[PDB]
Each structure stands twice: as C-alpha cells, then as structure tokens.
Design a protein around this ligand. Structure first.
Ligand SMILES: Cc1cc(O)c2c(c1)C(=O)c1cc(O)cc(O)c1C2=O
Length: 330
C-alpha cells in the first residue's frame, strides 16, 4: 500500500509560520564579500565537498577558516548559506563570517570564525566521565536550538563537533547536508556518514525529522562511554543495519517496519537473521567502566531506538539525570 506517514513530535510547524524567505533558499541572493580580504595560510583538511584552510583577514589581522567548495549544485550552496545565516548567533553554532568567490576554483568559499580543535582521534582517548557529560550537554544545546529553528543537521558525528578543550568550547560545524524540516516532506536518505546513519535511512523511510540527529548523537555517545569509535562499524549500508540489529535486536526492528508499513529491500532478507536485544553490560570492560554508569546507559538507551518517534528530543535529553551535575555547575 505504501508507508505510513510521520510528523516530528516537536517543532513540527515552525517553518510554516516563518516568512517564506526563511526556508525558501532557492530564492536566496548571495551578496559576495571581497576575496582579497583573505590570504590562505595553510591547508587544514580535505573533504568530499570541500578543502579547508586557515587564512588571515588582512583588513583586521584576524585568523579565519576558509572552506573552498568543490563543484556542487548551486541549490545546495544556497541551502547551506541560508541555514548558516538563519542559525548565526545560536549556541555552539559555527559562525559564518563572509562568502567570497575563490579566484582559482571560481566556486564559493565560505569564511568562518576561527576555532582551535583538538582532533577527536586524540581527544576521546583522554575524556573524563565528567567531560563527556559536559560536551554532550553542549552539543544538545546546538541541536535543540537548530531543531527549534526548523533545521535538521543530518551529519552529526565526531568530525563535525569541534572542541577547544583548553577553553571548554564547542562548535557544531559542516551544515552542508542540513535541511529545513516541513511536515509531510520526503527527504533523501543518502545523508550522514555510514556509522551515524539512523535505521530510517538504512531501510529507506523518507519521511524522517529532527530525531535523525538524536540517533547520530546516540552513536557518538556509545563510542565515547564504551571506547569503541566508531561504535556500529558497518562496511556498507546493509551491514550497518545488521550491526545495529545485533545489538538492538530484530524484534523491535520488525515492529518498526510493520508500524510504518515500510517495504524492506529484498536484500535484507538473508542477512538480518534473528537477534536478541543485548544488555549494555556486555560492552563494559576494565578499560571503560569508569565512563559507564546506570545514568549513562539509561540515557544512551533512550536515544538508540529504531522508531524515530520514540527517541528523546534534544530538550528531553537535556533534562536527563545523566546531566544533573553539569546543569548544577552551570
Ligand atoms: C580539519 C578541519 C578544521 C577546521 O577548523 C574546520 C573543518 C575541518 C571543517 O570541515 C569545517 C566545516 C565547516 O562547515 C565549518 C568550519 O568552520 C570547519 C572548520 O572550521
């Protein structure tokens, strides 16, 4: 018959109450900055969608980060820029400072406020129980804010959360896959990085929402408290669902496909099998026990649900007992 429709439980209609200019990004007019304003210092990183540099703004001597965009549909560039503008000033959202035309690629180059990251490959190895709660709490601020502003990030993962540890400062970056949420919309499921993909994406359920970001956040949390990064390490999108199903169980998976009347890809038949839902204690060992508590597990559990409608909202997440001590010190 066709899948059963779905709606975000919170912030459902925020965009519909906005001026259409707010979410109708195809009509956004970019006003360029001056590209002689910025001199590239060095290359920071290379991605699928861009190359990232450190630069100097020579007008005022400030350090900035410059993201030179690889060729992509102009619609996608307008979308990212409109999102960054709408979210600018929000808590723990990276600040877009300027937009220029790179003299070389002739593509757009986005200029952001500088940040001084400790790459997560060295950081997560050193994080205390307390730091994990503190940093999780700061991410939830960014996600509740962007959710409330009608936007889903759709690529939550360790690379996209910059932490200046020395200053206890966090920024959620890379809004290039972010989208405006509209009730009844069917989205592309080919978003997010494989290990952070929600079940909705893996079984091709298109009518998803903000709650996608909460599953991703759950994957990050799992890898920090168990010290296994990435946590669900699949080889492809098929094997990714199988790795999840080995932990969350198959009974809940099939109740979820039955509930939304999802057409499961024939390819999943012989690979999924039958799997009991595991107790989190099986991932606890001597090297990670100091990071795992009854609170951490209750919280993780409430994020990692197949049924996207069942997961905590970012705001519910923030009232969880896991964060009592960080809410107090703040
Ligand atoms: C290795 C690396 C260092 C960085 O400082 C950034 C990035 C990558 C990065 O990908 C990035 C994306 C973005 O959308 C905004 C940013 O400020 C950034 C960055 O600031």
């Amino acid at each position: 018959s066709g899948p059963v429709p779905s709606r975000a439980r919170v912030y459902t209609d925020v965009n519909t109450h906005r001026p259409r200019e707010y979410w109708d990004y195809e009509s956004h007019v970019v006003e360029w900055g001056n590209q002689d304003d910025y001199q590239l210092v060095r290359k920071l990183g290379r991605g699928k969608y861009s190359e990232v540099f450190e630069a100097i703004n020579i007008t005022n001597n400030e350090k900035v980060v410059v993201k030179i965009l690889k060729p992509v549909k102009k619609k996608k560039i307008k979308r990212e820029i409109k999102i960054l503008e709408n979210l600018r000033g929000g808590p723990n959202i990276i600040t877009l400072a300027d937009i220029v035309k790179d003299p070389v690629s002739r593509t757009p180059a986005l200029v952001f406020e500088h940040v001084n990251n400790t790459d997560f490959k060295q950081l997560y190895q050193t994080l205390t129980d307390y730091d994990i709660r503190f940093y999780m709490y700061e991410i939830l601020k960014a996600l509740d804010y962007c959710h409330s502003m009608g936007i889903m990030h759709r690529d939550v993962k360790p690379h996209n959360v910059m932490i200046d540890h020395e200053h206890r400062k966090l920024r959620l970056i890379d809004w290039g896959l972010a989208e405006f949420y509209h009730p009844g919309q069917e989205y592309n499921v080919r978003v997010a990085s494989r290990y952070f993909k929600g079940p909705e994406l893996l079984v091709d359920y298109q009518m998803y929402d903000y709650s996608l970001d909460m599953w991703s956040l759950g994957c990050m949390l799992a890898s920090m408290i168990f010290r296994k990064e990435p946590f669900f390490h699949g080889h492809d999108n098929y094997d990714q669902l199988v790795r999840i199903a080995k932990v969350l169980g198959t009974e809940d998976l099939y109740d979820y496909i039955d509930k939304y009347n999802i057409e499961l890809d024939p390819r999943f038949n012989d690979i999924l099998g039958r799997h009991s839902r595991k107790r989190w204690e099986r991932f606890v060992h001597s090297e990670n026990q100091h990071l795992v508590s009854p609170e951490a597990l209750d919280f993780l559990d409430k994020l990692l649900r197949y049924d996207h409608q069942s997961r905590l909202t970012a705001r519910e997440a923030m009232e969880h007992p896991y964060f009592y001590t960080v809410v107090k010190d703040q």
